[PDB]
Design a protein around this ligand. Structure first.
Ligand SMILES: Cc1cc2nc3c(=O)[nH]c(=O)nc-3n(C[C@H](O)[C@H](O)[C@H](O)COP(=O)(O)OP(=O)(O)OC[C@H]3O[C@@H](n4cnc5c(N)ncnc54)[C@H](O)[C@@H]3O)c2cc1C
Length: 455
């Protein structure tokens, strides 16, 4: 059969491989993965006696039309409940009014809905200013955390970097978001296991994809191929088709050396224009819980902060002021979330510094200087991960939904194909977008092979 190489073993690459290998008449296919494991941004780790998810954690919109929900159900990865609660702490050591929280959430999320109905950030700030003394500062402080939560959601440093006009293109499927009781990496491990033996090569990063050529294979019959995949280890792999599923952050940093000749101008510009920000998780293990047992999300409100003063490239007073709060993981574990440049800075700190700094933050925020220190920390480092360089894509100011279609556009003769979350116009930044993109590329190849047969 035709020689196919898939670059990257995340859900997009695995989905593309799954669909191509399932074909009763299958191609000769290999998946080349840079790192030691499969799953990419789906990464479940044994920690604190349980499982921590360093990447994807939720199925967004777990309903019939969500292929990730469909697969998790087929694999037995969902809990019974899935198959059918916040505490607000100020940086002053006091609780925040539930009524004021509701008022600000109604103002903020009402405006988010309106943006989906220049930048998202600028629209939100202009409207909030029109809506706008200790009650005023409190209201602006609450709003500041809501902006920081939207930064985590979009995977951006600032909502001022998020394009307004394309914002509504992102599709949210019905259903309350759920986790996988069976762990998220169980999904990618199951797909990987369905592939023929030795389909995936680990610790095998690709250096350059050479295309638009006539490359002779090493052995008889010295058959010529249009593509040659050059690995970092010197491996010289001829192919008829290469499906690239590498993250947009990797493409932004290396597209100039990763493709030979360079990509067509429109695709090279799409890579540069689209957003690719950082969102990280900080898991903190505690000997005893200090929060209410019914609590699920501890939202932190930073006193005297405001989103109206902030611009696209402004930093918070300290890196930890960008942290939104903590999700209780139901050992006693909390998961803090932090996006953007402050999150990239956190990655440069040692584990000890993060643990000590967040212990001091929690002591301040709870109004308890005796609060025991976290016993252990486990944090994601997505921006410094060399084969990812960030968390997920967004349609940045200066880019549009057409740029996500340009990411998906194949190279001549389908020599090189493109899948991955940043190739999906309406489900970018999700596991289902990434999965659907892999299936899309497999389907595109099958049509070409069916057409070669017919002629
Ligand atoms: C912190 C975080 C939280 C998230 N939360 C959610 C959530 O709750 N729900 C959700 O739906 N989505 C979420 N996402 C997004 C989701 O995880 C991704 O959109 C999706 O998993 C990406 O799949 P992919 O196949 O496109 O890319 P990846 O999973 O990143 O796979 C790409 C692969 O290519 C490999 N690679 C890179 N360069 C090379 C090279 N040169 N040679 C060979 N291989 C290479 C990488 O090592 C990697 O394995 C989150 C992501 C992060 C990081």
């Amino acid at each position: 059969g035709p020689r196919v190489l898939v670059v990257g073993s995340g859900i997009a690459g695995l989905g593309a491989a799954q669909k191509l290998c399932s074909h009763r008449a299958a191609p000769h296919l290999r998946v080349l993965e840079a790192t030691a494991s499969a799953g990419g941004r789906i990464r479940s780790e044994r920690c604190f006696g349980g499982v921590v998810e360093l990447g994807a954690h939720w199925i967004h919109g777990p309903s019939q039309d969500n292929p990730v929900f469909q697969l998790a159900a087929e694999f037995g990865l969902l809990g019974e409940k899935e198959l059918s609660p916040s505490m607000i702490w100020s940086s002053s050591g006091t609780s925040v009014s539930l009524e004021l929280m509701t008022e600000m959430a109604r103002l903020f999320y009402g405006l988010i809905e309106r943006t989906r109905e220049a930048s998202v950030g600028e629209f939100l700030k202009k409207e909030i200013s029109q809506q706008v003394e200790d009650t005023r500062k409190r209201k602006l402080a609450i709003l500041n955390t809501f902006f920081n939560i939207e930064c985590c959601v979009s995977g951006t440093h600032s909502m001022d970097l998020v394009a307004l006009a394309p914002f509504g293109e992102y599709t949210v499927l019905p259903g309350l978001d759920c986790i996988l009781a069976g762990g998220y990496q169980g999904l990618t491990d199951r797909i990987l296991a369905s592939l023929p033996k030795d389909t995936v090569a680990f610790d095998k990063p690709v250096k350059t994809i050479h295309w638009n050529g006539s490359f002779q294979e090493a052995a008889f019959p010295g058959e010529t191929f249009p593509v040659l995949v050059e690995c970092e280890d010197g491996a010289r792999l001829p192919a008829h088709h290469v499906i690239v599923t590498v993250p947009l952050g990797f493409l932004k940093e290396h597209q100039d050396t990763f493709f030979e000749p360079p990509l067509p101008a429109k695709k090279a510009e799409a890579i540069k224009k689209l957003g690719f920000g950082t969102n990280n998780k900080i898991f903190l293990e505690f000997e005893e819980p200090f929060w209410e047992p019914d609590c699920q999300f501890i939202q932190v409100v930073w006193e005297d902060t405001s989103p109206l003063q902030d611009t696209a490239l402004s930093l918070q007073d300290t890196w930890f002021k960008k942290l939104i709060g903590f999700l209780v993981q139901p050992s006693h574990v909390l998961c803090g979330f932090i996006a953007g440049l402050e999150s990239e800075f956190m990655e440069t700190l040692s584990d000890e510094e993060v643990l000590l700094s967040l212990t001091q933050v929690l002591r301040r925020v709870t109004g308890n200087p005796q609060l025991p220190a976290a016993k252990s920390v486990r944090r994601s480092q997505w921006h410094s991960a060399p084969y990812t360089r960030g968390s997920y894509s967004y349609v940045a100011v200066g880019s549009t939904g057409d740029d996500l279609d340009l990411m998906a556009q194949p190279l001549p003769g389908l020599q090189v194909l493109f899948a991955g979350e940043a190739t999906h116009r309406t489900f970018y930044s999700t596991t289902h977008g990434a999965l659907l993109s892999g299936w899309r590329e497999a389907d595109r190849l099958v049509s070409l092979w069916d057409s070669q047969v017919e002629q």
